[PDB]
Amino acid sequence: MSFIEKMIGSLNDKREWKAMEARAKALPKEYHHAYKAIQKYMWTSGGPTDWQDTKRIFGGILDLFEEGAAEGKKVTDLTGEDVAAFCDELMKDTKTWMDKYRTKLNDSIGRD
Amino acid sequence: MSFIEKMIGSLNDKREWKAMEARAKALPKEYHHAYKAIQKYMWTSGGPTDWQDTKRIFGGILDLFEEGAAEGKKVTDLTGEDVAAFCDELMKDTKTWMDKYRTKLNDSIGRD
């Protein structure tokens, strides 16, 4: 039943989210703050559009952050001070909501 | 009094908006539809961030659309079928909300 399968998928997704939130909380303050700042940035139209891609992107950020925190590195030693540019390289082959809106616009107008 | 001056600025802005809405409504159906589609696209993070720039951008779209409608041209004869790419050229030197969010992210993390 898709009704049930969707509900279970949501349980699973939210459980993975919770675990990812915990990974970020385990990091030092500056890293946890940076992760939350990047989340806000990604929860815009420059961000990923489904759970699969969100999981991949933020899980990668966490992997990088865990290595850096373990070496006592600063966040901006990893990402550069232009953190937004880092998010761009990170997202370059991932569909953004903006990508989807460009399609919506173009499909809407069609050959009018 | 800034309280009053702000209220009057809003009256003036909304009056200009109304007039622009009327310009678009005067266009043929396909052009009016295209304008509304572009509005939705711009009311995202790829769009302008203040009234001055909104006025400039949409007023320019209206100027173009009025010339094209007068020649019986199709909308996509003006913009191309990739309408999103047209909006990009249109916005290339105008600050977007995404531009502002990149700054917020970078300022938030600072040298952490």
Side-chain angles (χ1 to χ4, degrees), chain A residues 33 37 41 44-45 74-76 81-84 88 98 102 105-106 108 110 112, chain B residues 33 37 41 44-45 74-76 81-84 88 98 102 105-106 108 110 112:
Chain A
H33 175 264
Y41 175 78
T44 72
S45 305
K74 294 167 63 154
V75 187
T76 48
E81 286 192 356
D82 192 349
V83 191
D88 287 352
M98 275 300 107
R102 296 170 76 80
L105 177 60
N106 293 346
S108 183
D112 286 344
Chain B
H33 175 264
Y41 175 78
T44 72
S45 305
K74 294 167 63 154
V75 187
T76 48
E81 286 192 356
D82 192 349
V83 191
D88 287 352
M98 275 300 107
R102 296 170 76 80
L105 177 60
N106 293 346
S108 183
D112 286 344

PDB file of all heavy atoms in Angstrom, chain A residues 33 37 41 44-45 74-76 81-84 88 98 102 105-106 108 110-112, chain B residues 33 37 41 44-45 74-76 81-84 88 98 102 105-106 108 110-112, unseen atoms left out:
ATOM      1  N   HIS A  33      27.603  25.416  14.216  1.00  0.00           N
ATOM      2  CA  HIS A  33      27.055  26.685  13.765  1.00  0.00           C
ATOM      3  C   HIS A  33      27.174  26.785  12.251  1.00  0.00           C
ATOM      4  O   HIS A  33      26.215  27.117  11.570  1.00  0.00           O
ATOM      5  CB  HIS A  33      27.762  27.839  14.463  1.00  0.00           C
ATOM      6  CG  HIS A  33      27.342  29.186  13.974  1.00  0.00           C
ATOM      7  ND1 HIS A  33      28.050  29.880  13.018  1.00  0.00           N
ATOM      8  CD2 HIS A  33      26.294  29.969  14.312  1.00  0.00           C
ATOM      9  CE1 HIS A  33      27.451  31.033  12.785  1.00  0.00           C
ATOM     10  NE2 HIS A  33      26.388  31.114  13.561  1.00  0.00           N
ATOM     11  N   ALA A  37      24.197  27.122   9.496  1.00  0.00           N
ATOM     12  CA  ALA A  37      24.209  28.243   8.549  1.00  0.00           C
ATOM     13  C   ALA A  37      24.066  27.745   7.104  1.00  0.00           C
ATOM     14  O   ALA A  37      23.342  28.333   6.308  1.00  0.00           O
ATOM     15  CB  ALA A  37      25.458  29.050   8.697  1.00  0.00           C
ATOM     16  N   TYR A  41      21.039  28.230   4.208  1.00  0.00           N
ATOM     17  CA  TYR A  41      21.385  28.606   2.844  1.00  0.00           C
ATOM     18  C   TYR A  41      20.801  27.614   1.840  1.00  0.00           C
ATOM     19  O   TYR A  41      20.227  28.013   0.854  1.00  0.00           O
ATOM     20  CB  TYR A  41      22.899  28.707   2.692  1.00  0.00           C
ATOM     21  CG  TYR A  41      23.380  28.985   1.298  1.00  0.00           C
ATOM     22  CD1 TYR A  41      23.322  30.258   0.759  1.00  0.00           C
ATOM     23  CD2 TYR A  41      23.900  27.975   0.513  1.00  0.00           C
ATOM     24  CE1 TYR A  41      23.760  30.519  -0.526  1.00  0.00           C
ATOM     25  CE2 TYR A  41      24.338  28.225  -0.771  1.00  0.00           C
ATOM     26  CZ  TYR A  41      24.265  29.501  -1.287  1.00  0.00           C
ATOM     27  OH  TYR A  41      24.715  29.745  -2.567  1.00  0.00           O
ATOM     28  N   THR A  44      16.833  27.126   0.590  1.00  0.00           N
ATOM     29  CA  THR A  44      16.368  28.130  -0.308  1.00  0.00           C
ATOM     30  C   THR A  44      16.342  27.456  -1.668  1.00  0.00           C
ATOM     31  O   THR A  44      16.431  26.225  -1.789  1.00  0.00           O
ATOM     32  CB  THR A  44      17.304  29.346  -0.328  1.00  0.00           C
ATOM     33  OG1 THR A  44      18.524  29.000  -1.002  1.00  0.00           O
ATOM     34  CG2 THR A  44      17.607  29.846   1.091  1.00  0.00           C
ATOM     35  N   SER A  45      16.253  28.268  -2.702  1.00  0.00           N
ATOM     36  CA  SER A  45      16.083  27.723  -4.031  1.00  0.00           C
ATOM     37  C   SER A  45      17.405  27.216  -4.614  1.00  0.00           C
ATOM     38  O   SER A  45      17.410  26.482  -5.603  1.00  0.00           O
ATOM     39  CB  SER A  45      15.424  28.748  -4.947  1.00  0.00           C
ATOM     40  OG  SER A  45      14.190  29.215  -4.412  1.00  0.00           O
ATOM     41  N   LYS A  74      40.087  24.939  11.348  1.00  0.00           N
ATOM     42  CA  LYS A  74      38.933  25.820  11.261  1.00  0.00           C
ATOM     43  C   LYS A  74      38.020  25.397  10.115  1.00  0.00           C
ATOM     44  O   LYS A  74      38.481  24.860   9.113  1.00  0.00           O
ATOM     45  CB  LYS A  74      39.391  27.257  11.052  1.00  0.00           C
ATOM     46  CG  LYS A  74      40.127  27.803  12.229  1.00  0.00           C
ATOM     47  CD  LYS A  74      40.846  29.086  11.890  1.00  0.00           C
ATOM     48  CE  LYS A  74      39.888  30.168  11.493  1.00  0.00           C
ATOM     49  NZ  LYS A  74      40.429  31.532  11.752  1.00  0.00           N
ATOM     50  N   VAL A  75      36.726  25.676  10.257  1.00  0.00           N
ATOM     51  CA  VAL A  75      35.751  25.408   9.216  1.00  0.00           C
ATOM     52  C   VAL A  75      36.174  26.021   7.893  1.00  0.00           C
ATOM     53  O   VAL A  75      36.130  25.366   6.852  1.00  0.00           O
ATOM     54  CB  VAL A  75      34.349  25.958   9.555  1.00  0.00           C
ATOM     55  CG1 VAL A  75      33.367  25.486   8.525  1.00  0.00           C
ATOM     56  CG2 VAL A  75      33.891  25.521  10.926  1.00  0.00           C
ATOM     57  N   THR A  76      36.598  27.275   7.936  1.00  0.00           N
ATOM     58  CA  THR A  76      36.944  27.992   6.725  1.00  0.00           C
ATOM     59  C   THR A  76      38.283  27.554   6.142  1.00  0.00           C
ATOM     60  O   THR A  76      38.584  27.893   5.006  1.00  0.00           O
ATOM     61  CB  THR A  76      36.903  29.520   6.929  1.00  0.00           C
ATOM     62  OG1 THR A  76      37.597  29.879   8.120  1.00  0.00           O
ATOM     63  CG2 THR A  76      35.450  29.996   7.024  1.00  0.00           C
ATOM     64  N   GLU A  81      36.876  30.864   2.941  1.00  0.00           N
ATOM     65  CA  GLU A  81      36.063  31.893   3.570  1.00  0.00           C
ATOM     66  C   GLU A  81      34.815  32.182   2.762  1.00  0.00           C
ATOM     67  O   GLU A  81      33.803  32.556   3.330  1.00  0.00           O
ATOM     68  CB  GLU A  81      36.860  33.172   3.789  1.00  0.00           C
ATOM     69  CG  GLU A  81      37.860  33.062   4.926  1.00  0.00           C
ATOM     70  CD  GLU A  81      38.437  34.397   5.328  1.00  0.00           C
ATOM     71  OE1 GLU A  81      38.113  35.413   4.678  1.00  0.00           O
ATOM     72  OE2 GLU A  81      39.219  34.431   6.301  1.00  0.00           O
ATOM     73  N   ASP A  82      34.888  32.004   1.443  1.00  0.00           N
ATOM     74  CA  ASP A  82      33.709  32.041   0.602  1.00  0.00           C
ATOM     75  C   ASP A  82      32.975  30.703   0.677  1.00  0.00           C
ATOM     76  O   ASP A  82      33.073  29.857  -0.229  1.00  0.00           O
ATOM     77  CB  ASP A  82      34.087  32.364  -0.841  1.00  0.00           C
ATOM     78  CG  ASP A  82      32.884  32.687  -1.696  1.00  0.00           C
ATOM     79  OD1 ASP A  82      31.752  32.462  -1.234  1.00  0.00           O
ATOM     80  OD2 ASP A  82      33.074  33.178  -2.829  1.00  0.00           O
ATOM     81  N   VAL A  83      32.208  30.537   1.748  1.00  0.00           N
ATOM     82  CA  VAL A  83      31.484  29.290   1.995  1.00  0.00           C
ATOM     83  C   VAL A  83      30.398  29.012   0.949  1.00  0.00           C
ATOM     84  O   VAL A  83      30.110  27.859   0.612  1.00  0.00           O
ATOM     85  CB  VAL A  83      30.844  29.295   3.401  1.00  0.00           C
ATOM     86  CG1 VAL A  83      30.324  27.889   3.755  1.00  0.00           C
ATOM     87  CG2 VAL A  83      31.836  29.767   4.424  1.00  0.00           C
ATOM     88  N   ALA A  84      29.796  30.079   0.432  1.00  0.00           N
ATOM     89  CA  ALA A  84      28.781  29.970  -0.598  1.00  0.00           C
ATOM     90  C   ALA A  84      29.365  29.358  -1.873  1.00  0.00           C
ATOM     91  O   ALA A  84      28.710  28.550  -2.535  1.00  0.00           O
ATOM     92  CB  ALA A  84      28.190  31.322  -0.872  1.00  0.00           C
ATOM     93  N   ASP A  88      28.434  25.793  -3.893  1.00  0.00           N
ATOM     94  CA  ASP A  88      28.290  25.725  -5.358  1.00  0.00           C
ATOM     95  C   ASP A  88      29.012  24.557  -5.982  1.00  0.00           C
ATOM     96  O   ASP A  88      28.452  23.858  -6.827  1.00  0.00           O
ATOM     97  CB  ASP A  88      28.868  26.975  -6.032  1.00  0.00           C
ATOM     98  CG  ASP A  88      28.022  28.201  -5.836  1.00  0.00           C
ATOM     99  OD1 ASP A  88      26.882  28.093  -5.310  1.00  0.00           O
ATOM    100  OD2 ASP A  88      28.530  29.283  -6.215  1.00  0.00           O
ATOM    101  N   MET A  98      15.875  25.857  -8.007  1.00  0.00           N
ATOM    102  CA  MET A  98      15.938  26.824  -9.115  1.00  0.00           C
ATOM    103  C   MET A  98      15.908  26.135 -10.476  1.00  0.00           C
ATOM    104  O   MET A  98      15.175  26.560 -11.367  1.00  0.00           O
ATOM    105  CB  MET A  98      17.177  27.708  -9.022  1.00  0.00           C
ATOM    106  CG  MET A  98      17.009  28.914  -8.140  1.00  0.00           C
ATOM    107  SD  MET A  98      15.599  30.169  -8.672  1.00  0.00           S
ATOM    108  CE  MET A  98      14.410  29.907  -7.547  1.00  0.00           C
ATOM    109  N   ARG A 102      13.089  26.835 -13.352  1.00  0.00           N
ATOM    110  CA  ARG A 102      13.416  27.182 -14.740  1.00  0.00           C
ATOM    111  C   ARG A 102      12.615  26.307 -15.699  1.00  0.00           C
ATOM    112  O   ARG A 102      12.047  26.794 -16.675  1.00  0.00           O
ATOM    113  CB  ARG A 102      14.908  27.007 -15.024  1.00  0.00           C
ATOM    114  CG  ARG A 102      15.820  27.921 -14.227  1.00  0.00           C
ATOM    115  CD  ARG A 102      17.277  27.515 -14.377  1.00  0.00           C
ATOM    116  NE  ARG A 102      17.823  27.910 -15.674  1.00  0.00           N
ATOM    117  CZ  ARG A 102      18.241  29.140 -15.979  1.00  0.00           C
ATOM    118  NH1 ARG A 102      18.182  30.117 -15.074  1.00  0.00           N
ATOM    119  NH2 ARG A 102      18.717  29.392 -17.200  1.00  0.00           N
ATOM    120  N   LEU A 105       8.895  27.366 -15.593  1.00  0.00           N
ATOM    121  CA  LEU A 105       8.705  28.585 -16.375  1.00  0.00           C
ATOM    122  C   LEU A 105       8.670  28.272 -17.876  1.00  0.00           C
ATOM    123  O   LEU A 105       7.730  28.640 -18.597  1.00  0.00           O
ATOM    124  CB  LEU A 105       9.837  29.571 -16.067  1.00  0.00           C
ATOM    125  CG  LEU A 105       9.805  30.874 -16.879  1.00  0.00           C
ATOM    126  CD1 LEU A 105       8.535  31.624 -16.623  1.00  0.00           C
ATOM    127  CD2 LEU A 105      10.988  31.707 -16.565  1.00  0.00           C
ATOM    128  N   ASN A 106       9.704  27.579 -18.338  1.00  0.00           N
ATOM    129  CA  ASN A 106       9.825  27.225 -19.752  1.00  0.00           C
ATOM    130  C   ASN A 106       8.676  26.346 -20.250  1.00  0.00           C
ATOM    131  O   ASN A 106       8.163  26.563 -21.332  1.00  0.00           O
ATOM    132  CB  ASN A 106      11.173  26.548 -20.005  1.00  0.00           C
ATOM    133  CG  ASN A 106      12.363  27.496 -19.813  1.00  0.00           C
ATOM    134  OD1 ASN A 106      12.219  28.724 -19.736  1.00  0.00           O
ATOM    135  ND2 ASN A 106      13.548  26.920 -19.769  1.00  0.00           N
ATOM    136  N   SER A 108       5.677  26.196 -18.843  1.00  0.00           N
ATOM    137  CA  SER A 108       4.476  27.020 -18.748  1.00  0.00           C
ATOM    138  C   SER A 108       4.256  27.871 -19.985  1.00  0.00           C
ATOM    139  O   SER A 108       3.160  27.938 -20.523  1.00  0.00           O
ATOM    140  CB  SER A 108       4.569  27.915 -17.508  1.00  0.00           C
ATOM    141  OG  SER A 108       3.387  28.669 -17.375  1.00  0.00           O
ATOM    142  N   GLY A 110       5.921  27.537 -22.928  1.00  0.00           N
ATOM    143  CA  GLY A 110       5.916  26.656 -24.090  1.00  0.00           C
ATOM    144  C   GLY A 110       6.350  27.399 -25.334  1.00  0.00           C
ATOM    145  O   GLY A 110       7.375  28.091 -25.324  1.00  0.00           O
ATOM    146  N   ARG A 111       5.564  27.272 -26.401  1.00  0.00           N
ATOM    147  CA  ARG A 111       5.848  27.967 -27.649  1.00  0.00           C
ATOM    148  C   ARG A 111       4.952  29.202 -27.830  1.00  0.00           C
ATOM    149  O   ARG A 111       4.765  29.654 -28.951  1.00  0.00           O
ATOM    150  CB  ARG A 111       5.695  27.001 -28.841  1.00  0.00           C
ATOM    151  CG  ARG A 111       6.557  25.733 -28.736  1.00  0.00           C
ATOM    152  CD  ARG A 111       6.558  24.932 -30.035  1.00  0.00           C
ATOM    153  N   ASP A 112       4.422  29.755 -26.733  1.00  0.00           N
ATOM    154  CA  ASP A 112       3.540  30.954 -26.791  1.00  0.00           C
ATOM    155  C   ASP A 112       4.257  32.221 -27.295  1.00  0.00           C
ATOM    156  O   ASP A 112       3.607  33.189 -27.723  1.00  0.00           O
ATOM    157  CB  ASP A 112       2.915  31.255 -25.408  1.00  0.00           C
ATOM    158  CG  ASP A 112       1.800  30.277 -25.019  1.00  0.00           C
ATOM    159  OD1 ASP A 112       1.274  29.551 -25.901  1.00  0.00           O
ATOM    160  OD2 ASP A 112       1.445  30.252 -23.814  1.00  0.00           O
TER     161      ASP A 112
ATOM    162  N   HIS B  33      -0.157  35.802 -19.657  1.00  0.00           N
ATOM    163  CA  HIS B  33       0.177  34.533 -19.031  1.00  0.00           C
ATOM    164  C   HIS B  33       1.685  34.432 -18.850  1.00  0.00           C
ATOM    165  O   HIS B  33       2.164  34.100 -17.776  1.00  0.00           O
ATOM    166  CB  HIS B  33      -0.370  33.379 -19.860  1.00  0.00           C
ATOM    167  CG  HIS B  33       0.026  32.032 -19.351  1.00  0.00           C
ATOM    168  ND1 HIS B  33       1.102  31.337 -19.857  1.00  0.00           N
ATOM    169  CD2 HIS B  33      -0.511  31.250 -18.389  1.00  0.00           C
ATOM    170  CE1 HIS B  33       1.212  30.184 -19.223  1.00  0.00           C
ATOM    171  NE2 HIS B  33       0.242  30.105 -18.333  1.00  0.00           N
ATOM    172  N   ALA B  37       3.801  34.095 -15.390  1.00  0.00           N
ATOM    173  CA  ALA B  37       4.731  32.974 -15.216  1.00  0.00           C
ATOM    174  C   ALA B  37       6.121  33.471 -14.792  1.00  0.00           C
ATOM    175  O   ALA B  37       6.758  32.883 -13.925  1.00  0.00           O
ATOM    176  CB  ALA B  37       4.831  32.166 -16.468  1.00  0.00           C
ATOM    177  N   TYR B  41       8.366  32.987 -11.255  1.00  0.00           N
ATOM    178  CA  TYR B  41       9.771  32.610 -11.326  1.00  0.00           C
ATOM    179  C   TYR B  41      10.642  33.602 -10.558  1.00  0.00           C
ATOM    180  O   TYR B  41      11.496  33.202  -9.801  1.00  0.00           O
ATOM    181  CB  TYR B  41      10.217  32.507 -12.781  1.00  0.00           C
ATOM    182  CG  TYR B  41      11.678  32.228 -12.979  1.00  0.00           C
ATOM    183  CD1 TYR B  41      12.194  30.954 -12.815  1.00  0.00           C
ATOM    184  CD2 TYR B  41      12.551  33.237 -13.335  1.00  0.00           C
ATOM    185  CE1 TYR B  41      13.540  30.693 -12.992  1.00  0.00           C
ATOM    186  CE2 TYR B  41      13.896  32.986 -13.513  1.00  0.00           C
ATOM    187  CZ  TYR B  41      14.386  31.710 -13.340  1.00  0.00           C
ATOM    188  OH  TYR B  41      15.730  31.464 -13.529  1.00  0.00           O
ATOM    189  N   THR B  44      11.089  34.092  -6.422  1.00  0.00           N
ATOM    190  CA  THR B  44      11.878  33.088  -5.789  1.00  0.00           C
ATOM    191  C   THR B  44      13.207  33.761  -5.496  1.00  0.00           C
ATOM    192  O   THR B  44      13.344  34.992  -5.561  1.00  0.00           O
ATOM    193  CB  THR B  44      12.081  31.871  -6.702  1.00  0.00           C
ATOM    194  OG1 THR B  44      12.981  32.215  -7.766  1.00  0.00           O
ATOM    195  CG2 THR B  44      10.748  31.372  -7.277  1.00  0.00           C
ATOM    196  N   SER B  45      14.203  32.948  -5.207  1.00  0.00           N
ATOM    197  CA  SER B  45      15.473  33.493  -4.780  1.00  0.00           C
ATOM    198  C   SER B  45      16.304  33.998  -5.961  1.00  0.00           C
ATOM    199  O   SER B  45      17.276  34.731  -5.772  1.00  0.00           O
ATOM    200  CB  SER B  45      16.241  32.467  -3.952  1.00  0.00           C
ATOM    201  OG  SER B  45      15.474  32.001  -2.848  1.00  0.00           O
ATOM    202  N   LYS B  74       5.105  36.267 -31.335  1.00  0.00           N
ATOM    203  CA  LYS B  74       4.963  35.387 -30.186  1.00  0.00           C
ATOM    204  C   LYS B  74       5.908  35.810 -29.066  1.00  0.00           C
ATOM    205  O   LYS B  74       6.982  36.346 -29.322  1.00  0.00           O
ATOM    206  CB  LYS B  74       5.257  33.950 -30.594  1.00  0.00           C
ATOM    207  CG  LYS B  74       4.247  33.403 -31.546  1.00  0.00           C
ATOM    208  CD  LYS B  74       4.720  32.120 -32.184  1.00  0.00           C
ATOM    209  CE  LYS B  74       4.920  31.039 -31.166  1.00  0.00           C
ATOM    210  NZ  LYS B  74       4.771  29.675 -31.746  1.00  0.00           N
ATOM    211  N   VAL B  75       5.514  35.532 -27.825  1.00  0.00           N
ATOM    212  CA  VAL B  75       6.344  35.800 -26.666  1.00  0.00           C
ATOM    213  C   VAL B  75       7.724  35.186 -26.820  1.00  0.00           C
ATOM    214  O   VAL B  75       8.737  35.841 -26.573  1.00  0.00           O
ATOM    215  CB  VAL B  75       5.736  35.251 -25.357  1.00  0.00           C
ATOM    216  CG1 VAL B  75       6.554  35.724 -24.192  1.00  0.00           C
ATOM    217  CG2 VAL B  75       4.303  35.690 -25.177  1.00  0.00           C
ATOM    218  N   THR B  76       7.765  33.932 -27.244  1.00  0.00           N
ATOM    219  CA  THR B  76       9.018  33.214 -27.345  1.00  0.00           C
ATOM    220  C   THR B  76       9.854  33.651 -28.544  1.00  0.00           C
ATOM    221  O   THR B  76      11.027  33.310 -28.616  1.00  0.00           O
ATOM    222  CB  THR B  76       8.810  31.686 -27.343  1.00  0.00           C
ATOM    223  OG1 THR B  76       7.777  31.327 -28.258  1.00  0.00           O
ATOM    224  CG2 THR B  76       8.431  31.211 -25.937  1.00  0.00           C
ATOM    225  N   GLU B  81      12.714  30.340 -26.534  1.00  0.00           N
ATOM    226  CA  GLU B  81      11.937  29.312 -25.859  1.00  0.00           C
ATOM    227  C   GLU B  81      12.484  29.023 -24.477  1.00  0.00           C
ATOM    228  O   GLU B  81      11.728  28.650 -23.596  1.00  0.00           O
ATOM    229  CB  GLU B  81      11.877  28.032 -26.683  1.00  0.00           C
ATOM    230  CG  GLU B  81      10.959  28.142 -27.887  1.00  0.00           C
ATOM    231  CD  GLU B  81      10.677  26.806 -28.530  1.00  0.00           C
ATOM    232  OE1 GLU B  81      11.250  25.791 -28.084  1.00  0.00           O
ATOM    233  OE2 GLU B  81       9.876  26.773 -29.488  1.00  0.00           O
ATOM    234  N   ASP B  82      13.791  29.201 -24.290  1.00  0.00           N
ATOM    235  CA  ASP B  82      14.385  29.164 -22.969  1.00  0.00           C
ATOM    236  C   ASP B  82      14.169  30.503 -22.265  1.00  0.00           C
ATOM    237  O   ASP B  82      15.077  31.348 -22.183  1.00  0.00           O
ATOM    238  CB  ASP B  82      15.874  28.839 -23.056  1.00  0.00           C
ATOM    239  CG  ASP B  82      16.476  28.517 -21.708  1.00  0.00           C
ATOM    240  OD1 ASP B  82      15.801  28.743 -20.689  1.00  0.00           O
ATOM    241  OD2 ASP B  82      17.624  28.025 -21.672  1.00  0.00           O
ATOM    242  N   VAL B  83      12.968  30.669 -21.723  1.00  0.00           N
ATOM    243  CA  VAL B  83      12.584  31.917 -21.062  1.00  0.00           C
ATOM    244  C   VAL B  83      13.397  32.195 -19.792  1.00  0.00           C
ATOM    245  O   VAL B  83      13.672  33.348 -19.445  1.00  0.00           O
ATOM    246  CB  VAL B  83      11.081  31.913 -20.711  1.00  0.00           C
ATOM    247  CG1 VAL B  83      10.633  33.320 -20.271  1.00  0.00           C
ATOM    248  CG2 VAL B  83      10.272  31.442 -21.884  1.00  0.00           C
ATOM    249  N   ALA B  84      13.785  31.128 -19.100  1.00  0.00           N
ATOM    250  CA  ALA B  84      14.597  31.238 -17.902  1.00  0.00           C
ATOM    251  C   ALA B  84      15.962  31.848 -18.225  1.00  0.00           C
ATOM    252  O   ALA B  84      16.483  32.656 -17.454  1.00  0.00           O
ATOM    253  CB  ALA B  84      14.748  29.886 -17.268  1.00  0.00           C
ATOM    254  N   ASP B  88      17.762  35.412 -16.918  1.00  0.00           N
ATOM    255  CA  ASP B  88      19.171  35.480 -16.489  1.00  0.00           C
ATOM    256  C   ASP B  88      19.926  36.647 -17.076  1.00  0.00           C
ATOM    257  O   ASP B  88      20.644  37.345 -16.361  1.00  0.00           O
ATOM    258  CB  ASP B  88      19.944  34.229 -16.923  1.00  0.00           C
ATOM    259  CG  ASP B  88      19.585  33.004 -16.131  1.00  0.00           C
ATOM    260  OD1 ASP B  88      18.845  33.113 -15.117  1.00  0.00           O
ATOM    261  OD2 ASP B  88      20.055  31.921 -16.554  1.00  0.00           O
ATOM    262  N   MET B  98      19.333  35.356  -3.796  1.00  0.00           N
ATOM    263  CA  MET B  98      20.430  34.388  -3.639  1.00  0.00           C
ATOM    264  C   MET B  98      21.760  35.077  -3.344  1.00  0.00           C
ATOM    265  O   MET B  98      22.489  34.651  -2.450  1.00  0.00           O
ATOM    266  CB  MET B  98      20.581  33.503  -4.872  1.00  0.00           C
ATOM    267  CG  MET B  98      19.683  32.297  -4.880  1.00  0.00           C
ATOM    268  SD  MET B  98      19.927  31.044  -3.393  1.00  0.00           S
ATOM    269  CE  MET B  98      18.591  31.307  -2.447  1.00  0.00           C
ATOM    270  N   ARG B 102      24.026  34.377  -0.015  1.00  0.00           N
ATOM    271  CA  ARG B 102      25.451  34.028  -0.063  1.00  0.00           C
ATOM    272  C   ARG B 102      26.234  34.904   0.910  1.00  0.00           C
ATOM    273  O   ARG B 102      27.079  34.416   1.659  1.00  0.00           O
ATOM    274  CB  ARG B 102      26.022  34.202  -1.471  1.00  0.00           C
ATOM    275  CG  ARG B 102      25.419  33.288  -2.520  1.00  0.00           C
ATOM    276  CD  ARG B 102      25.852  33.693  -3.920  1.00  0.00           C
ATOM    277  NE  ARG B 102      27.231  33.296  -4.200  1.00  0.00           N
ATOM    278  CZ  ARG B 102      27.611  32.066  -4.549  1.00  0.00           C
ATOM    279  NH1 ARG B 102      26.712  31.090  -4.668  1.00  0.00           N
ATOM    280  NH2 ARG B 102      28.901  31.813  -4.777  1.00  0.00           N
ATOM    281  N   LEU B 105      25.401  33.848   4.537  1.00  0.00           N
ATOM    282  CA  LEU B 105      26.129  32.628   4.878  1.00  0.00           C
ATOM    283  C   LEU B 105      27.594  32.940   5.207  1.00  0.00           C
ATOM    284  O   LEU B 105      28.116  32.573   6.270  1.00  0.00           O
ATOM    285  CB  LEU B 105      26.048  31.641   3.708  1.00  0.00           C
ATOM    286  CG  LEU B 105      26.837  30.338   3.900  1.00  0.00           C
ATOM    287  CD1 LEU B 105      26.336  29.590   5.095  1.00  0.00           C
ATOM    288  CD2 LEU B 105      26.761  29.505   2.679  1.00  0.00           C
ATOM    289  N   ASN B 106      28.251  33.633   4.283  1.00  0.00           N
ATOM    290  CA  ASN B 106      29.661  33.985   4.442  1.00  0.00           C
ATOM    291  C   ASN B 106      29.925  34.865   5.666  1.00  0.00           C
ATOM    292  O   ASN B 106      30.884  34.648   6.381  1.00  0.00           O
ATOM    293  CB  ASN B 106      30.174  34.661   3.169  1.00  0.00           C
ATOM    294  CG  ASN B 106      30.218  33.712   1.965  1.00  0.00           C
ATOM    295  OD1 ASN B 106      30.113  32.484   2.092  1.00  0.00           O
ATOM    296  ND2 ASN B 106      30.408  34.287   0.794  1.00  0.00           N
ATOM    297  N   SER B 108      27.956  35.018   8.330  1.00  0.00           N
ATOM    298  CA  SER B 108      27.627  34.195   9.490  1.00  0.00           C
ATOM    299  C   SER B 108      28.796  33.344   9.948  1.00  0.00           C
ATOM    300  O   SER B 108      29.109  33.277  11.129  1.00  0.00           O
ATOM    301  CB  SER B 108      26.429  33.301   9.156  1.00  0.00           C
ATOM    302  OG  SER B 108      26.066  32.548  10.289  1.00  0.00           O
ATOM    303  N   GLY B 110      32.008  33.675   8.893  1.00  0.00           N
ATOM    304  CA  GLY B 110      33.148  34.554   9.126  1.00  0.00           C
ATOM    305  C   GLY B 110      34.452  33.811   8.945  1.00  0.00           C
ATOM    306  O   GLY B 110      34.643  33.118   7.938  1.00  0.00           O
ATOM    307  N   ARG B 111      35.344  33.937   9.925  1.00  0.00           N
ATOM    308  CA  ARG B 111      36.623  33.242   9.891  1.00  0.00           C
ATOM    309  C   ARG B 111      36.624  32.007  10.806  1.00  0.00           C
ATOM    310  O   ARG B 111      37.686  31.554  11.210  1.00  0.00           O
ATOM    311  CB  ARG B 111      37.763  34.206  10.275  1.00  0.00           C
ATOM    312  CG  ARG B 111      37.830  35.474   9.409  1.00  0.00           C
ATOM    313  CD  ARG B 111      39.105  36.274   9.662  1.00  0.00           C
ATOM    314  N   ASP B 112      35.444  31.455  11.111  1.00  0.00           N
ATOM    315  CA  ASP B 112      35.327  30.257  11.988  1.00  0.00           C
ATOM    316  C   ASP B 112      35.961  28.989  11.385  1.00  0.00           C
ATOM    317  O   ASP B 112      36.252  28.021  12.107  1.00  0.00           O
ATOM    318  CB  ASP B 112      33.848  29.957  12.330  1.00  0.00           C
ATOM    319  CG  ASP B 112      33.248  30.936  13.347  1.00  0.00           C
ATOM    320  OD1 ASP B 112      34.010  31.662  14.034  1.00  0.00           O
ATOM    321  OD2 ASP B 112      31.997  30.962  13.458  1.00  0.00           O
TER     322      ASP B 112
END
